[PDB]
């Protein structure tokens, strides 16, 4: 009975040694637990990431059809690792950032390092030597696609990446700076260097009695080298306001039973919150105490 597995692990064990950590996993393991991670503003996605947030030191890829949430998740990423001392750098190539928004989310823009490169090449160096300073915690490159090499501006892209990614995946691992890339093209590279790959797509248009409060987004963790992959999460994005914390709690809060649905009436053990997800949201919105409790308990029911 044991000889079988008693060898799988001897093997499986040397596999890690020779190649890494998450080289060979059990989609069922609760395994590991690092003390470095950046929340993403979605408890739903954090437990989905398996480590409660984006691993620091790794390269992260977040792709999906336009207007489905990538950058929103990224700005929060920033918001967090920034509220926690470290600073973030944003290498712009799309030229479509809205600070008033990045701000609401929680970014301290006035102290955010933005760079508007000219070549896709110049961009990866500014991003390279910048990460080497060992100062940035998180850096985000907006659009793996908008990174044209000098030639085209004056095949070579997926090389530009290949090149840059090797020379850059290195430092990152020393530096400890986690890096984010937004996609929709030069793939291959990133599709491998990535330690984590999030697939973000929009599932519904959040109706709010009126016409719309936001969008229900779904993320699928297609690649996870820091824990088991394939787990997925969904959350809401309120038009110009961001990933609804609270709303993320109702859902997580009932899919774990700390919140009961007695027929559209969300109740938190005994006492009611409201009637209609958006109403209970409201309750949670203006009730931080109770809120933090669910989060707290939700957070203790998992890790
Ligand atoms: N400045 C803004 N004002 C209002 N809503 C915004 C703003 N920026 C982003 N959003 C919301 O984010 C959604 C798309 O996410 P981002 O805008 O994250 O796109 P990606 O999904 O990054 O293209 C939009 O449909 C919208 O609901």
Swiss-Prot record:
GO biological process per UniProt: DNA recombination; DNA repair; SOS response
Question: What InterPro entries has UniProt attached to this entry?
Answer: AAA+_ATPase (IPR003593), DNA_recomb/repair_RecA (IPR013765), DNA_recomb/repair_RecA_CS (IPR020584), P-loop_NTPase (IPR027417), RecA-like_C (IPR049261), RecA-like_N (IPR049428), RecA_ATP-bd (IPR020588), RecA_C_sf (IPR023400)
Q: From what superkingdom does this record's organism come?
A: Bacteria
**Observed phenotype of the null mutant:** Not essential in the absence of DNA damage, its deletion renders cells much more sensitive to DNA damaging agents such as UV light, ionizing radiation, alkylating agents and DNA gyrase inhibitors and desiccation-induced DSBs. 5-fold decrease in survival, loss of HR, no change in NHEJ (non-homologous end-joining) or single-strand annealing DSB repair.
Q: Which SUPFAM superfamilies match?
A: P-loop containing nucleoside triphosphate hydrolases, RecA protein, C-terminal domain
Gene Ontology CC annotation, any one:
cytosol
Pfam families assigned to the protein according to its UniProt record, in alphabetical order: RecA, RecA_C
What are the protein's GO molecular function terms?
A: ATP binding; ATP hydrolysis activity; ATP-dependent DNA damage sensor activity; damaged DNA binding; single-stranded DNA binding
Q: Where does phosphate bind?
A: 67-71, 184
Chain positions recorded as ATP binding sites: 67-72, 98-101
Compartment(s) of residence: Cytoplasm
Q: How does it assemble?
A: Polymerizes non-specifically on ssDNA to form filaments. Interacts with and activates LexA leading to autocatalytic cleavage of LexA, which derepresses the SOS regulon and activates DNA repair.
- What's the stated role of this polypeptide? Required for homologous recombination (HR) and the bypass of mutagenic DNA lesions (double strand breaks, DSB) by the SOS response. Can catalyze the hydrolysis of ATP in the presence of single-stranded DNA, the ATP-dependent uptake of single-stranded DNA by duplex DNA, and the ATP-dependent hybridization of homologous single-stranded DNAs. Numerous X-ray crystals have been resolved under different conditions which indicate the flexibility of the protein, essential to its function.
The text of the family note is:
Belongs to the RecA family.
The protein in question is named: Protein RecA
| Protein's organism | Mycolicibacterium smegmatis (strain ATCC 700084 / mc(2)155) (Mycobacterium smegmatis)
Encoding gene per record: recA
